[PDB]
Every structure is written in structure tokens, then in C-alpha cells.
Design a binder for this molecule. Sequence first.
Ligand SMILES: CNC(=O)CN1Cc2ccc(Cl)cc2[C@H](C(=O)Nc2cncc3ccccc23)C1
Ligand SMILES: CNC(=O)CN1Cc2ccc(Cl)cc2[C@H](C(=O)Nc2cncc3ccccc23)C1
Ligand SMILES: [Cl-]
Lengths: 298, 301
Amino acid sequence: SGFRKMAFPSGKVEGCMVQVTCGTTTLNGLWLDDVVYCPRHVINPNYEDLLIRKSNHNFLVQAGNVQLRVIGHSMQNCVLKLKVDTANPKTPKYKFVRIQPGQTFSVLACYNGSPSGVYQCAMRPNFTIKGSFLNGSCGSVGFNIDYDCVSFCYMHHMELPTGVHAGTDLEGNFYGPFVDRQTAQAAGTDTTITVNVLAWLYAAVINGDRWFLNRFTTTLNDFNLVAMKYNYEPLTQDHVDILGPLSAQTGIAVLDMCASLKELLQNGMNGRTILGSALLEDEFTPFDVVRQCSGVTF
Amino acid sequence: SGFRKMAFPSGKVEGCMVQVTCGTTTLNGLWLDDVVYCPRHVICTSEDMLNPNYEDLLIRKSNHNFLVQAGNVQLRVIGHSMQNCVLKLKVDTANPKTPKYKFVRIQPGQTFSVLACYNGSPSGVYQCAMRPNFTIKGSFLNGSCGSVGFNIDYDCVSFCYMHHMELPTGVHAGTDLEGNFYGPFVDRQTAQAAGTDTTITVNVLAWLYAAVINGDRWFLNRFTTTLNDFNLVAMKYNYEPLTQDHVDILGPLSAQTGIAVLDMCASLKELLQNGMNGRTILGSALLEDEFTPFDVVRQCS
Ligand SMILES: CNC(=O)CN1Cc2ccc(Cl)cc2[C@H](C(=O)Nc2cncc3ccccc23)C1
Ligand SMILES: CNC(=O)CN1Cc2ccc(Cl)cc2[C@H](C(=O)Nc2cncc3ccccc23)C1
Ligand SMILES: [Cl-]
């Protein structure tokens, strides 16, 4: 019993965190094999013009108390790739993956190449992450661990004026219509990840919380007409299919659980809580619920 | 900016997790130097749990009855001793991944990270607090026994909790790393229940100061209170009494934000009376109590 916002064990990622310094700027890098990946803003910025003026020795890379020597440098989209002399012996089995909004991941927040904390979070429908970052956190990474393979999905780049965060995948492509520079940019209006709220309602049922269940059902179209009114993401047939295992385990059909959500949106919680929360939680996917309520290890 | 329930990086602890098997029972162990620490109930059967005589069950065991697995390698047990509710298995290999560490006993209200493990394999990490009733509201399934709670301050891992059991309300009970339980609990399947739980007042205040640091002042008011009047009110909401030590501990946050502790107490008194009125504080519709004054300074500064 119990339900917590749980992150993947960060150990395999901690062994990859390095400090990258270029001039006055200091941020984090991800050292995998003989390459260090970091945000290109470490160097209206023309990044080809600023980079062509740099030599290998202008980049100081520190792995613990050891300085790594940069032997080459190249740019791929908004990530700087620093070729180093030493291959990281702690390099885990890994992939670079690009996630979709609604998908969750773990963030190992670092300052000066040192990991300070780990938290779980979701890619919002507006492509931002509601993270906890201070200056110096740039280059911190987001990941999922699947079996023994670390799938790197996020690299932190900047903070938006509303306090939310923006970053790229490990190939340097931003999530969202953001650019790496000081200019007027704002996060779009956010929506609730409906499939995740439903997964969390199924997690509550598994943990013994059933007060919100009702005898009713709904059509997918009627549910979406109500979801659109409450700034909830449209629920698709794929979402319904993905919730199948949870539906079969608890005996509550997805459209039956949708009618409970319809009632919660129109009427509120009435002084009650679900899994110790007075708000409808949307940062646990259907897979996170199955993994936590079944105990999968890495 | 931003405020998250943040756990310590688990790497230094992952390198210590081993699987301990005794007969039919399999649970987790903490391998530090040449010793593996695990719950002593690993020597028990399910029947033994009502009234187990651990000294009697342990005297019948030999070193080779305990199977310890570190990754894909079996460790050889060369000795065994019991210290309170923990079994200490002396092994023939010192863990090369042993970090710099201490065994610390925490007080209620203190927070720590939990690396939840099954079969000696870490599956997840989360943050939690020692509740005033000495339980932890964790997320554990069968096989998680032996999972540990810790804090990492500088390069030193302070082990403060080892998981032993789930109480009937779904909450969890365990011991410090010297085998002394937190609370009036015993490693017996007896009728035991958690005492009435209360809110950790000093932590809610620390979290209100975190919200002020992040730009949220909507809940502040023009009032102050005496410590005694605050406690008379807070007790009616099942909030832990706030002591002068708590007030002293909140001093740095008070000085940083410019809001006196008793002024912030007046805001809390008003929030308990009115509720939030459709509003949130740091993305929460409830008053958060699992961030200490130390956690707030660490995450915001
Ligand atoms: C709010 N940001 C600033 O005033 C300065 N910033 C301007 C800027 C512009 C473009 C790009 Cl790509 C990066 C940055 C830098 C930036 O966003 N880094 C930060 C990252 N995460 C949390 C941060 C909390 C606080 C400060 C800075 C953070 C630095
Ligand atoms: C609810 N517990 C049971 O039915 C069986 N239990 C009885 C018992 C009694 C005393 C002691 Cl010290 C340990 C245990 C064992 C126990 O509590 N382990 C578990 C730990 N954490 C989460 C657990 C979720 C589910 C099951 C078991 C968990 C095993
Ligand atoms: Cl303490």
C-alpha cells in the first residue's frame, strides 16, 4: 500500500554528470562514452559565429575532481557535443529518445556537475515542465530506465517568466515553440492530461479509495465535450486501449471511470481527498501506475 | 523557481542493496563494508510471526542457511549476530561501492529519501517524513522489507530507516539502522495500530515561507499571535504543538522573507479557519507538511 510520486533510481545517470565551463558560464554536461553533451548557450546569438571563435582548450570539463581534455567540438541543433580524450567507464546502456506531452520522466537536478536531487515530472501538453531549478541547473537531464537501459529524453535549457521550465531532447531539438536566447517567450495555456488523471483514479481504487465511483457510464464523445469545457486534453481511443489492463484489474470500465471524472469536474471533491490529494493528479501515466502498484525493479 | 518534493540522488545507496534469503523468505539487505544489515524477521516463517522468539530461531541457524546475493554474485556469510530488530550478517567480501556513511536516528517531522527495493533490486526513489505517530506514509509492496531511508549531506549517506512492516491502515513501520523501532511497534503480527496522526506544524510553516520566497503572498494577513494562542488554535485542527525550538529553527526563513514566525503563524491560523477558497500554494490545495525548514533552505537557496 501507498502511492508516491516516484522517480527512477538515478545511479546510472549520476555517473555521467560533469561540469562544463566556458568563460564566465558554468553548467552541467552529460558524459557518455567519449562525448560530453551540454546546452549550446554555454558559449540574437549566431551560435555558428560564437562557436567558430572557440578552441578545444576554451572548454573546461570537470568529472569529479578530474579535468577532462576536450579534443573536438561540434553542434547538433541546440546541444554542444564536446569530444573528450577519456571514455566514461561508468557509461550505462543508453538511448536518446524524444517523449510526447503527457509522458513522465525523472530529473536529476545538478549544480556544478554535482547531482543534488531527483524528482519525477511530466512533459505538459504546452511542452513545458513544472520543475524545480535554480541558476546553474542548465544541462540537468530527464530520463526513464527501461530494464537496464537509460532512455535520455530531456536536457534543461531555461526558465520561462511563469517559473516553468523549457528544454530539448538529447539531439538538441526543443520541446515546444521555444528558442535558446533572451527574448519575449511565454508558455502557452496548459491543459490537464486526462489519461493520466484516469490512471491515478485507478491507482486510488487499487489502494482502497472508491468514494468517487458511481453506477454511470458515458460515451467517449460526451466525455470529450465535458473535458474540452474543463481544459482537459481530449481522451482518444488509444488512451482508452492503454487503460485496458487497469480497467480489467479493477473491474471498472474506462468509460465508467470517465463518468466518475465527469462528476468530479462538475461537482468537486466536497471536502474529500483522493490518495491524500484535494486536486486531480495528472503526472502519473498508466504505465507508472502499473509499475508502482506491481513493483518493477532496475 | 519551482518547488518539488525532491529526493536525494540514490546512486550511493543502490550500490549497497543486496538480496537476503533464509528458507522461504526473501527480503533486502544493506551491504556496508563486510556486513549486511537486514530485518531479523527474515529468520521467521509466517506462523512464527504471532509470537516469535528470535533468540530461539537464530540459535538454530548456521552461516550457510543465509543466502546473500549482490547482483549476480553470491556472498559468503562468515558470521551472524542480532542487534535489537536487525540481523547483521558478517560476509567474506567488503563492498567496494561502500560510501562514506553514518547511522542516524531521526525525530518525527524529519524527512528522508526512500529507495524502495524488491529482491535486492532498486525499483524507485521517493521522499517522505517520519510522521508524529512514528509511522511513514510510504509506497511499499510485499518483498520491500529491508528497503532503506536516507539523507545525503555533502558526500556522506546518513542511513536513518529500514522498512519492516505495513500496519493495517496502509502506513509503514520500521527501525533505525541499530534495530530500534520508531514508535511503539514490534516485529510481531499482533494487533497494533498507528496512533492518531497529526500535522507537522513547523514543516507547514517552512512550506509557507517557501511559497513567499517563490512570490506567493496571498495568504499573509495583518495579524500576529502569541505562541500559546497559536497552539490552542492549532491543537483544534490536529496540528502538532509548535515549540520555541521550532520558532528558533524558522529564524533564518523569517529573516530572509521579512515575516516574523508569529506573523506567519497568524497566516496559518487564518488558512485553517478559511481554507484556500479555490486557490493553491505551490501547486497544492492542501497545507504541505513533508518539507522541513532545512529542506526549504536547501531547495530555495
Ligand atoms: C530567469 N532567467 C534569467 O533571468 C536568466 N536566464 C536567461 C536565459 C535565457 C535563455 C536561455 Cl536558453 C537560458 C537562460 C538562463 C536560464 O534561464 N537559466 C535557468 C534555468 N533554470 C532555472 C533558472 C532559475 C533562475 C535563473 C535562471 C534559471 C539564464
Ligand atoms: C500486510 N502484511 C501482511 O499481510 C503480511 N506481513 C506480516 C508482517 C508482520 C510483521 C512484520 Cl515485522 C512483517 C510482516 C510482513 C510485512 O508487513 N511486509 C510488508 C511490508 N511493506 C509493505 C507490505 C505490503 C503488503 C504486504 C506486506 C508488506 C508480512
Ligand atoms: Cl532529526
